[PDB]
Every structure is written in C-alpha cells, then in structure tokens.
C-alpha cells in the first residue's frame, strides 16, 4: 500500500552532471559520451556570441576533474561542448521529446552537483512546476525504461509566475518560449484529465472508493463538462490507455468519468483522495501501473 | 521559485542495494563495505512469524543458506550476526560503490528519502517523514522489505530507516540501521496497530514559512499567540505540541521572512479554524507536514 510522488532512481543521471562555466555564468551540463550538453544561454544573437568564444573559454568540471573542451557547436537552444574525455559512467540513453501530460524525474543540480530529485509533469501549457533556484539551469528531466535513460528535458528559465521553461535535449523548447530576458508568460493552464483519472484508479487500488458512483457517462458529455472545468479533453486514446486500470479495478473509464464529473461539480466535501484535497494530475496511467505493480530499474 | 517534495539523489544508495534470499523469502539488503544489512525476518517461514525465536532460527542457518545477489554477481556469505531486528551478513567482497555513510536514528517529524527496491533492484525514490506515531506513509508492495530511508547531507549518506513491515492501515513500520524499531512495533505477525497519528506542527509552520518565501501571504494575520494558547488550540486539531525547541529551530525562517514564530502560530490557528476557503498554499489544499524547517532552508536558499 501507499501512493507517493515517486521519481526514477537518479543514479544513472548523477554520473553525467558536470559544471559548465563560461565567464561569469555557471550552470550544469549533461556529459554523455564525449559531449557536454548545456543551455546555450551560458555564453550570454547566439551564432554571433558563440563565434567569439574559444574552446578554452568553456571550463567544464566533473567532480574535482576538469574536462578540456576540444569543440563546440549549437543545436537549437543547447550548446554541445565536445570534450576530450568520454564519460565512463555514460548510461544507455535516448533523447526523447515528451508530450504535455507526460511525467518525468528532475535531478536538480547546482554547480554540477545533484542536490535533489523530484517528479513532475509537462503541463498542457508546456511549463513545468519545478523547484529551481539560480544555478539550476542545465538540470535534466528523464525517465527510465528498463536500463535506458530517456532524457526529455533540460531546464533553461523561470517564468514570472514561478513556473519553469526548458527544452528537450535537442534544444527545442517546450512551449512558445525563447531563451532571453523578455516579456514571456505561461499561458492558461489546464488539468491533465487522463492523469486525474489514473490517480482515481490508484486511489481505488489503495482502498479509497467513496467517490465511486453507479453512473457512467458518454465521452462527449464528459468532454463538455471537462472543458467547463479547465480540464484537458479526454480522447479515445486516453480511454484505451486507461484500459488496464479499468480492467484491474472493475470500473469502466466512463464510469470513473461520471465520478470525476461529480467531483468537479460537487467537490471533495471535506474528504481526501490519497491524502489529497485536490485532484492530482501528475501521475500518468503508466506511473500508476508502475507504482501499484512494482516495476524495477 | 517552486516548492516540491524533493528527495535526495538516490545514486549513492543504488550502488548498495542487493537481493537477499533465504529459503522462499526474498527481500533487499544494504551492502556497505563487506556487510549486507537486511531485516532479520528474512529467516522466517511465515508459519514461524507470529512468535519467531530469531536466535533459535538463526543458529540453524549456515552461511551458504543466505544467497546474496549484487546485479548478476552472487556474493559469498562468510559470516552472519544479528543486531536487534537486522541481520548483518558478512560477505567476501567489499562494495566498491560504498559511499561515505553514517547510521543515524531519527526522531518523529524528521524527513528522509526512500529508495524503494524489489529483488535488490531500485524502482523508485520518494520523500517521507517519520510520523509522530513512528510509522511512515510509504509506497511499498510485498518484496520491498530492506528498502532504506536516507538523507544525503554534503557527501555523506545518513541511513535512518530500513523497511520491515506494513501495518493493517497501509502505513509502514521499520527500524534504524542498528535494527531498533521506530515505535512500539515488533517483527511479528501479531496484532499490531499504528497509534493515532498527529500533524507535525513544526513542519507545517516551516511549510507556511516556505509559502511566505515563495510570495504567498494570504494566510498571515495581525494576531500573535502565547505558545500555551497555540498548543491548546493545536491539540484540538490533532497537532503535535510545539515546543520551545521547535520555536528556536524556526528562528532562521522567522528572521528571513520577518514574521515572528508565534505570529506564524497565530496564522496556523486561523487556518485550522477557517480552512483554505478554496485557496491553496504552495499548490496544496491541505497543511503539508512533511517538510522540516531544515528542508525548507535547503530547498529555498541552499
Ligand atoms: C512480510 C510482511 C509485510 O508486512 N511485508 C510488507 C512490507 N511492506 C509492504 C507490504 C505490502 C503488502 C504486503 C506485504 C508488505 C507480512 O506480510 N507480514 C509481516 C509480519 C511481520 C513482518 Cl516484520 C513483516 C511482514
Ligand atoms: Cl531527527
């Protein structure tokens, strides 16, 4: 029993974190093979700023050992520093771009030194509600699938509302954001409906059935209610994805949708679901199956 | 900005997790130097669980009965001793990935990260607090025994918990790494219940200071309270008595925000009386009690 916001073990990623210094700016780098990936704003027209830099201007540090930079290129908003030493601790990895609603683990780092690990979700507005201070830039988001680390996020900036914006590891931002000091705002956020439903199934699995009802709804009627409560549209793909949880608990997806419709119109009424007074939307249907079945890495 | 339930990076601990098999029972072990620490109930046969005599069960076991596995490599057990409710298996190989470590016993209200493992393989990491009733509200399935709780302050890993059992309410009970249980619990299948839980008042106040630091002041008020009057109200909501030690511990947060501890205590009393009124504090509709005053300073400043 128990349901917790659980991150993937960060060990495979810790072995990659390095400190990248360029002039006054100090942030984190991801050292994979002989390349160190970091936000391109470490140099701060990035093509013009980078052409003025030499390899010895980038001081890379892995523990107490300094890596010597032998090349530098830019791929969208990420700087790829070619180094002389290939990281022996480089895990099996892939660079994946995640979709909003998908969750990942963030290894927050300051001065190439991992300080904490937390779970979060790519919000529908392409921001993440992270926990970052100055020096956290270059901190990465990842998932582990068997023995392979899928890098999906690299932290770049904090928006004025306290939410965070970053890129995939190919330097492509999530959202309509740019990497410079300018007026940028996080768009109106929405709740990840498929994730709330997954968390309601986890609650059922954990012996919390008060919110269940004899009712079931149509996908059209659920989406009409969901749009009114700033909830993401639930697709037939989402219903199919919730299939295993629906099978395991005995509550059809549209039965749990009638439960969510009642929770949205009526509220929790002094009650909690999995120790929460709010509808949690940062557990995907896969996170619920992984935690309520015990998959290992 | 941002406030998250943040666990310590688990890497230093992952390198220690091993699978301990003794007969039918398979659980996790913590391999530090040439010793593998695991719950002593690994020697029990379920029908030797209501009233196990571990000294009698262990005297019957030999070193080759304990199959220890670190990855695909099998460790050879060369000795075995028992220290309270933990089994210490002396192995022939010292773990090269052994970090700088200490065994620390924690007090209720203290938090720690848990690296949940199954078959000596880490599956997840989460942040926990030792509840005032000495249980933890973990996320554990069968086969998670031996999973450890830790804090990684500086470069040293302080091991504070080893998972042993799940109580009938779904909460978990375990020991420090010296095998001493937290709480009035025993490693027996006998009827054991978690005592009435309470809210860690010092941690709620710390989380309210984190909220002030993050620009959330809606809950603040023009009132102060005596410490006695705060506890009289707090006790009625099942909140732990706030001691002068707790007030002293909150001193730095009070200094940083400019809100005296007893004024933050008046805000808390008001939140207990009124609730949130559709509002949230740091994305929560409930008063969070699993962030110590130290966790708040670490996450908000360094
Ligand atoms: C092995 C066991 C235990 O609580 N294990 C578990 C530990 N943690 C989580 C579990 C979730 C589901 C099932 C079993 C879980 C048990 O089933 N009875 C019993 C009695 C005494 C002790 Cl010290 C240990 C146990
Ligand atoms: Cl303590």
From Swiss-Prot, chain A:
Give start and end of each Peptidase C30 domain. 1-297
The record's subcellular location field reads:
Host cytoplasm; Host Golgi apparatus; Host nucleus
Positions of the catalytic residues: 41, 137
Under catalytic activity, the entry for this protein gives: TSAVLQ-|-SGFRK-NH2 and SGVTFQ-|-GKFKK the two peptides corresponding to the two self-cleavage sites of the SARS 3C-like proteinase are the two most reactive peptide substrates. The enzyme exhibits a strong preference for substrates containing Gln at P1 position and Leu at P2 position
Q: Where is this cross-link: Glycyl lysine isopeptide (Lys-Gly) (interchain with G-Cter in ubiquitin)?
A: 5, 82
Q: How is its activity regulated?
A: Inhibited by pyridone-containing alpha-ketoamides compounds 13a and 13b. In turn, alpha-ketoamide 13b (tert-butyl (1-((S)-1-(((S)-4-(benzylamino)-3,4-dioxo-1-((S)-2-oxopyrrolidin-3-yl)butan-2-yl)amino)-3-cyclopropyl-1-oxopropan-2-yl)-2-oxo-1,2-dihydropyridin-3-yl)carbamate) inhibits SARS-CoV-2 replication in human lung cells. Inhibited ex vivo by michael acceptor inhibitor N3. Inhibited ex vivo by compound 11a and 11b.
Source taxon at top rank: Viruses
Topology check: give the Cytoplasmic ranges.
1-297
- What's the subunit arrangement here? 3CL-PRO exists as monomer and homodimer. Only the homodimer shows catalytic activity. Interacts with host FBXO22; this interaction promotes the proteasomal degradation of nsp5.
Role: Cleaves the C-terminus of replicase polyprotein at 11 sites. Recognizes substrates containing the core sequence [ILMVF]-Q-|-[SGACN]. Cleaves and inactivates human TRMT1, preventing tRNA guanine(26)-dimethylation of tRNAs. May cleave human NLRP1 in lung epithelial cells, thereby activating the NLRP1 inflammasome pathway. May cleave human GSDMD, triggering alternative GSDME-mediated epithelial cell death upon activation of the NLRP1 inflammasome, which may enhance the release interleukins 1B, 6, 16 and 18. Also able to bind an ADP-ribose-1''-phosphate (ADRP).
What protein name does the entry list?
Answer: 3C-like proteinase nsp5
* Native source species: Severe acute respiratory syndrome coronavirus 2 (2019-nCoV)
């Amino acid at each position: 029993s128990g349901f917790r916001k659980m991150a993937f073990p960060s060990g495979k990623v810790e072995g990659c974190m390095v400190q990248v210094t360029c002039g006054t700016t100090t942030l984190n780098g991801l050292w994979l093979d002989d390349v160190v990936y970091c936000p391109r704003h470490v140099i701060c027209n990035y093509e013009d700023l980078l052409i003025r830099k030499s390899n010895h201007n980038f001081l890379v540090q892995a523990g107490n050992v300094q890596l010597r930079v032998i090349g530098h290129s830019m791929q969208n908003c990420v700087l790829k520093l070619k180094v002389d030493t290939a990281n022996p601790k480089t895990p099996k990895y892939k660079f994946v771009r995640i979709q909003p609603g998908q969750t990942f683990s963030v290894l927050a780092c300051y001065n190439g030194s991992p300080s904490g690990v937390y779970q979060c979700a790519m919000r529908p507005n392409f921001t993440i509600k992270g926990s970052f201070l100055n020096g956290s830039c270059g901190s990465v988001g990842f998932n582990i699938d068997y023995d392979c680390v899928s890098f999906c996020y690299m932290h770049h900036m904090e928006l004025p509302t306290g939410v965070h914006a970053g890129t995939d590891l190919e330097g492509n931002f999530y959202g309509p954001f740019v990497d410079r000091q300018t007026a940028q705002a996080a768009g109106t956020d929405t709740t990840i409906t498929v994730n709330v439903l997954a968390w309601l199934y986890a609650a059922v699995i954990n012996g919390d059935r008060w919110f269940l009802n004899r009712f079931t709804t149509t996908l059209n009627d659920f989406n009409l209610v969901a749009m009114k409560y700033n909830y993401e549209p639930l697709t037939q793909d989402h219903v199919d994805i919730l299939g295993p949880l629906s099978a395991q608990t005995g509550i059809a997806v549209l039965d749990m949708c009638a439960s969510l419709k009642e929770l949205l119109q009526n509220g929790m009424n002094g009650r909690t679901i999995l120790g929460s007074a709010l509808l949690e939307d940062e557990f995907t249907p896969f996170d619920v199956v992984r935690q309520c079945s015990g998959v290992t890495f």
